[PDB]
RNA sequence: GCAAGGCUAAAACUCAAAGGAAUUGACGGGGGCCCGCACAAGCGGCGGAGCAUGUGGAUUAAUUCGAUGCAACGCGAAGAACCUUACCUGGGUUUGACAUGCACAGGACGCGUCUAGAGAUAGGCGUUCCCUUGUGGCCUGUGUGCAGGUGGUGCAUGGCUGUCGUCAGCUCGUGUCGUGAGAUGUUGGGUUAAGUCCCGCAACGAGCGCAACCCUUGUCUCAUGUUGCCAGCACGUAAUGGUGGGGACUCGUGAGAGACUGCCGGGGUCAACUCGGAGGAAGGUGGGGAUGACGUCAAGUCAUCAUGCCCCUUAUGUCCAGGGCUUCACACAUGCUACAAUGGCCGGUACAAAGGGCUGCGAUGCCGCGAGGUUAAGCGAAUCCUUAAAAGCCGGUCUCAGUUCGGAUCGGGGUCUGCAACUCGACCCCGUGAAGUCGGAGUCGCUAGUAAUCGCAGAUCAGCAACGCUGCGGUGAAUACGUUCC
């Protein structure tokens, strides 16, 4: 808003995993308010993934969001007659938020059956680094790579 | 609304069914409260008024 | 509805409260009991006798 | 309009109820029996100057309270019109009635009482700028009257084109709901209608 | 004057203004500042399909009527079978379905019967109590004044209400300045959610304004122990606090403390105030509700009610019996349902608040798959019912399919209220099982216990509200870098 900055409210570490990311997680996948079955479908899909690979889940999460991390973003402006796209850096909380929106949004929409198979290849194509999300940040880093003309 | 109305309300009803319930000051046969039996807007007017011995504005 | 016609959106909301206590298991003995059959309290306050 | 009632907006607060009584299951019947005898001081005794009535039922026992600017014509001939009144009053509620009028202070400081007399100055065609002046004036000399609020609405002098216009004076803070203000309506025959009078006299804040 | 054209220069006719300065207001795609789910980041929808409600148009006996941008469209209307009802057809009544003055008399009245669709009409009854001797109450017939209208005029109106808008400014007294309208105060610099305050100022003061006092919620103390609770015990019915016993505890409802920039550090004209800290339930207004200024929209309401003028009085008054207010080639607006695997079904299973209850809550028990019916105890209620909470958890099935998704339509069969349910109610059982696979351009709401989601209760009411309204509770997120841009 207009007079100045909110905080964000904290979140909190999973007796489980340790870590603020699996919480941030499970609330991106949280919708109508099933905070229980969210914290189940990342719990199968991060047991799926250990399963098939053996390291720790929370290790090829890391792995994946590095590697699915945006550095740049296409924000448009318009000024005169004609509007174009000017590309700016990125924070890491932004550029992680919007990792994890990307990842959840192409999990979402996958040709499979249930969320936590989906989720597991979901991010295992991420820690990969040849998945949706990681087509995605390429389109959105080199499109906007192409508009490095208009930098102002 | 009208007095011969309100008459035929008032009056014995042959097949009781045919009875219903109107304001107590104005005869509005809608939004009749049975716990006062005045109308919405009468029983406004009463409780700002303070005639009515337990009712006055709420707020919570 | 604060209007009379038309105006949904404008409500005023009313309480009615009531206040019950003194539910005590007094004695009846007759003295007491003829003292508070005799004495009257004001309207505004309903005595239930049990 | 849009300003809501002093008294509803003081009630529960500071100011008290006009009719007492307890009913669980006889509500219906008490509240059409306060109106109809309301409607019946109303009606005829309007010329008494009505400001406030009290009503007070003890154990299927009327008990009324009337508070009139002179006692001496709701008395009538020593008894006479009040006792017809009361036996009114008893043919109108079915059981026993007592109808008592204890006094008013002054009918200058009173609300419903100087809006009836400003009405009675517009039915007789005097001028109503003049009447509220007067009126004003006679609120400042009455002894606690920290400012005193009156509207004239309608026609105002028989114009076809209606206008609404109110004087001040003092303080009438309508936003102090610790304060207490003396409200009243009341309306004024004309022979083009009527004019409605409201009056909000301010007295201090609490005692 | 080569020309273009220059110079001198009218009239008829037309209108009562054309114009010059300065003031206020408003406007600007002018300048400066600030703010708002207003932009931006996201969350969930509409517009696509079916259903419910309101509207326009068409039909008809009416589809009574009003409302028409935001601020009308689940509005008036918090409950249309006749009743409501104000509309249509037909039939009655007509000094009247109701209240009074004046001339007369006596019944008025309560019941059943047949006439009738009922309204209305008479055949049989009791009777005039009041000293109809006179006064006194009541009513019929001639009436007479009158009653009546949901007929109109909200552009004659009062009251009430919406809107700008919880917008923070709007004015007054005295004085001063100018012929005047008018200005000043209300300007200048910091400061605030705020014309909140601070320092100067021909200004000095004040009112309506702001916060505040009212209510709810957030901690503790004092008081209180029943119908509520069970700390140390007895009692263990039945473990359903069931009983004594207890004020240990919540809790309930009466009174206070506390949170008011209170204190400190730096800054700020040292002042306002700003930023951060300790103690704390909460920090700057702890959160929210009530609280709506001068006025505007000739805004709405002559249909809550009331009111000036006109309009009828065998009728535009009134009643009754049916129909209609619920129609249907179409469009709009507001809600629900889905289009599925965050899921459907089967079995088990744990945790609420706030409300309602003698024309009632129907604890159990029985009948019925079922809604429901029967006898019946307790309950004017912290002891009784409502009362089972659903979302949440476990095991199996289904395996992305117009489907174990979807419940619109239709046939058959029952229950409940109502004299009466085709019009014109709700619910229950079986079978049949449509569109719909995420919705075009476009468009709506939302910053914290918010959006999102799931259930509960009330009001209207005999039945019609688990799709409207108002409140209650559970789980419960992501984004705000920034004010250039609509
Ligand atoms: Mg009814
Ligand atoms: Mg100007
Ligand atoms: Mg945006
Ligand atoms: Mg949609
Ligand atoms: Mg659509
Ligand atoms: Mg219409
Ligand atoms: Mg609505
Ligand atoms: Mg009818
Ligand atoms: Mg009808
Ligand atoms: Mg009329
Ligand atoms: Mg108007
Ligand atoms: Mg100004
Ligand atoms: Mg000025
Ligand atoms: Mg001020
Ligand atoms: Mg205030
Ligand atoms: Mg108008
Ligand atoms: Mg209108
Ligand atoms: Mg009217
Ligand atoms: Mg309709
Ligand atoms: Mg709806
Ligand atoms: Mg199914
Ligand atoms: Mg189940
Ligand atoms: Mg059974
Ligand atoms: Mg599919
Ligand atoms: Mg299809
Ligand atoms: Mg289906
Ligand atoms: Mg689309
Ligand atoms: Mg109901
Ligand atoms: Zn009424």
């Known amino acids: 808003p207009r007079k100045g900055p909110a905080p964000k409210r904290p979140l909190v570490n999973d007796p489980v995993y340790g870590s603020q990311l699996v919480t941030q997680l499970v609330n991106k996948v949280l919708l109508k308010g099933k905070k229980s079955l969210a914290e189940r479908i990342v719990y ?109 | 609304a009208k007095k011969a109305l309100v008459n035929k309300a008032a009056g014995k009803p042959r097949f009781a069914v045919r009875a ?16 006062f039996g005045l109308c919405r807007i009468c029983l406004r007017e009463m409780a700002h008024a303070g005639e009515l011995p337990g009712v006055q504005k709420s707020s919570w | 509805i604060r ?48 | 309009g849009q300003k809501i009632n002093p008294h509803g907006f003081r009630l529960g607060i500071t100011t008290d109820w006009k009719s007492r009584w307890y009913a669980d299951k006889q509500y219906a019947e008490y509240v059409k ?12 005794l309007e010329r008494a100057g009505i400001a406030d009535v009290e009503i007070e039922r003890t154990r299927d026992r009327v008990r009324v309270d009337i508070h009139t600017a002179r006692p001496g014509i709701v008395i009538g001939r020593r008894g006479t019109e009040a006792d017809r009144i009361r036996a009114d009053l008893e043919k109108l509620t079915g059981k026993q ?22 009405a009675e100055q517009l039915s007789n065609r005097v001028a109503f700028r003049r009447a509220m002046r007067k009126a004003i004036q006679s609120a400042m000399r009455q002894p606690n009257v920290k400012g005193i609020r009156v509207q004239c609405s309608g026609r105002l002098g028989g114009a076809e084109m209606s206008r609404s216009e109110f004087y001040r004076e003092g303080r009438v803070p309508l936003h102090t709901l610790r304060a207490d203000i003396d409200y009243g309506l009341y309306e004024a025959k004309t022979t083009f209608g009527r004019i409605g009078v409201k009056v909000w006299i301010y007295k201090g804040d609490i005692v």
Request: charged share 30%.
């Open chain 3, 3 to 50: 209007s009379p016609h038309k105006y949904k959106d404008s409500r005023e909301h009313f309480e009615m409260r009531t206040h019950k206590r003194l539910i005590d298991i007094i004695d009846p003995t007759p003295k007491t009991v003829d003292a508070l059959m005799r004495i009257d309290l004001p309207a505004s306050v309903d005595v239930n006798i049990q």
């Open chain 1, 44 to 152: 199968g899909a991060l047991e799926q993934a250990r399963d098939k690979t053996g390291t720790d889940p929370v290790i090829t999460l890391k792995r994946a969001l590095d590697n699915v991390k945006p550095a740049l973003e296409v924000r448009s402006r318009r000024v005169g007659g004609a509007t174009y796209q000017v590309p700016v850096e990125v924070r890491p909380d932004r550029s992680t938020t919007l990792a994890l929106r990307w990842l959840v949004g192409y999990s979402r929409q996958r040709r499979e059956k249930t969320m936590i198979e989906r989720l597991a290849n979901e991010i295992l194509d991420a820690s990969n680094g040849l998945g949706a999300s990681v087509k995605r940040r390429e389109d959105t880093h080199k499109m906007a790579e192409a508009n490095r003309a208009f930098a102002h």
């Open chain 4, 97 to 118: 009635v007592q109808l008592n009028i204890l006094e008013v202070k002054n009918p200058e400081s009173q609300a419903q009482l100087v809006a009836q007399g400003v």
């Open chain 4, 33 to 44: 029996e306060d109106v109809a005898i309301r409607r019946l001081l109303s009606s005829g």
């Open chain 2, 20 to 35: 219903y319930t109107r304001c107590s000051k104005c005869g509005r046969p809608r939004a009749v409260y049975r716990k």
